[PDB]
Amino acid sequence: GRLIYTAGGYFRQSLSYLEAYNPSNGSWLRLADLQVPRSGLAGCVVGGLLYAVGGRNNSPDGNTDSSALDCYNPMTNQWSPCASMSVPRNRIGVGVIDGHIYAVGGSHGCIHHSSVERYEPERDEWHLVAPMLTRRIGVGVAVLNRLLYAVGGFDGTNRLNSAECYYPERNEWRMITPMNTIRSGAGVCVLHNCIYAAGGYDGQDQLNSVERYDVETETWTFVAPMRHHRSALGITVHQGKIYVLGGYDGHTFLDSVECYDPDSDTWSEVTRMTSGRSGVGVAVTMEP
Numbered sequence: 001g002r003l004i005y006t007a008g009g010y011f012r013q014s015l016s017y018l019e020a021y022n023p024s025n026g027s028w029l030r031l032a033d034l035q036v037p038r039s040g041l042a043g044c045v046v047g048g049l050l051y052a053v054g055g056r057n058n059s060p061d062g063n064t065d066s067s068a069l070d071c072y073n074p075m076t077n078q079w080s081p082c083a084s085m086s087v088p089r090n091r092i093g094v095g096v097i098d099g100h101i102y103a104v105g106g107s108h109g110c111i112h113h114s115s116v117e118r119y120e121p122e123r124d125e126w127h128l129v130a131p132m133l134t135r136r137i138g139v140g141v142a143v144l145n146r147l148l149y150a151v152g153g154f155d156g157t158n159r160l161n162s163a164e165c166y167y168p169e170r171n172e173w174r175m176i177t178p179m180n181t182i183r184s185g186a187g188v189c190v191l192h193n194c195i196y197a198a199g200g201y202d203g204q205d206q207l208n209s210v211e212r213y214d215v216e217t218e219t220w221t222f223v224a225p226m227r228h229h230r231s232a233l234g235i236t237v238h239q240g241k242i243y244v245l246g247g248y249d250g251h252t253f254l255d256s257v258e259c260y261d262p263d264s265d266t267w268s269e270v271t272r273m274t275s276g277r278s279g280v281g282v283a284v285t286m287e288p
């Protein structure tokens with residue numbers, strides 16, 4: 001894996017862009033568009049292939065929540081459809097455990113899901129697993145030590161500071177320590193032994209604060225805030241650093257890409273996306 005891929009997003013309407021950033025030389029490549037423009041989707045990688053999951057096609061012709069799973073192969077620069085999920089999931093969170101994709105929460109119209117389902121690429125099948133204890137849309141999801149975490153979000157009435165963990169061998173969800181901040185549409189990732197929650201929306205403001213959950217201590221601690229307040233940001237980890245892409249700051253759909261170095265506890269601007277956007281799906285895989 002060597003490029004940071006950003007798929008979809010929103011700027012005036014849902015986007016079909018697939019673009020890839022090379023941290024080693026600062027270059028951006030524009031690759032094959034998604035077959036359907038989608039915002040509020042998630043991206044992930046299994047076996048070197050990039051998957052785009054869920055989202056919504058917000059267009060002048062009609063708004064449709066997506067149950068789609070599409071696969072991009074960097075060796076061919078082509079997207080291929082996969083089996084669709086049981087239900088549409090806009091503002092979804094996804095995590096990968098042992099080659100399986102877990103699709104978590106998200107919305108279908110006014111329905112805010114607590115349901116979760118798992119995709120097996122070798123069978124091209126989805127199956128429902130135990131639902132979360134809380135309905136969550138705009139939920140951040142990360143995997144640490146083969147355990148799946150669902151962080152923050154919106155339950156249909158309130159934005160959440162709560163978080164929960166899924167234990168696959170017990171098919172059970174249990175609440176973990178809540179975050180110090182309410183966050184919906186935060187960027188959630190894993191770095192070292194911690195789950196980071198960056199930015200998001202608390203129901204009033206877009207946030208620049210960043211906190212991390214240490215799974216051995218069960219505590220959330222704030223780290224250095226980002227240079228920009230961002231909600232509905234893309235996030236990924238590459239070579240021990242967190243990269244945040246775009247998002248909305250309450251005024252502009254950002255093109256800013258910042259990088260967090262955990263050793264210095266500093267955020268730096270590293271590049272700008274080709275255009276400002278929010279609600280993207282991000283993941284790292286081999287160059288095309």
Ligand SMILES: Cc1ccc2cc1[C@@H](C)N1Cc3cc(ccc3OS1(=O)=O)OCCOCCn1nnc3c(C)c(ccc31)[C@H]2CC(=O)O
Nearest residue numbers: 010039040091138154159184185200201231232248278279
């Ligand atoms: C992916 C995603 C996750 C979480 C949220 C929204 C979205 C969707 C709707 N994206 C964010 C977005 C934002 C936008 C237009 C399109 C758009 O499309 S998108 O990029 O796919 O305009 C923002 C105008 O400010 C409203 C206040 N605000 N700021 N951040 C917000 C967020 C994060 C949510 C809700 C309201 C938010 C939350 C939902 C909530 O808490 O209710």
